[PDB]
């Protein structure tokens with residue numbers, strides 16, 4: 001029996017933001033966002049996930065404070081995601097995620113009737 005490291009995370013921080021996905025957004029913009037953010041998060045040691053439904057964003061990031069902020073300063077110069085109201089930046093221990101996630105991928109499949117494919121013609 002070996003002892004686990006337990007909650008070891010002195011310098012993590014989790015910025016948890018609420019945004020309202022601007023109508024100026026394109027799927028291609030999300031699909032570009034997702035790809036570049038994973039890559040940055042992987043490097044910056046940031047873990048994450050994203051909840052996007054009804055055009056509203058709940059997205060948060062767990063990482064070492066300044067990385068998170070490096071990320072914040074890179075994101076907060078947006079116009080993409082309606083307001084991006086972080087409003088919550090809290091120092092965490094992290095462990096929860098090992099990678100950042102995004103719901104929007106190459107299509108969503110089936111749930112398109114709830115926003116994507118509103119009408120035909």
Ligand SMILES: Cc1cc2nc3c(=O)[nH]c(=O)nc-3n(C[C@H](O)[C@H](O)[C@@H](O)COP(=O)(O)OP(=O)(O)OC[C@H]3O[C@@H](n4cnc5c(N)ncnc54)[C@H](O)[C@@H]3O)c2cc1C
Nearest residue numbers: 033034036037040041048057059061071074075080081100
């Ligand atoms: C809903 C949403 C969620 C997001 N979540 C995350 C996230 O979790 N993590 C994250 O990191 N980002 C996130 N972003 C930001 C998104 O991924 C941006 O497109 C951004 O990541 C672009 O790459 P960047 O992080 O390197 O910063 P950016 O500065 O926006 O990169 C793009 C620009 O940087 C320039 N650039 C790159 N490297 C250099 C350099 N060395 N010197 C000078 N200029 C340079 C490029 O020329 C380009 O013009 C999110 C954005 C949105 C809308």
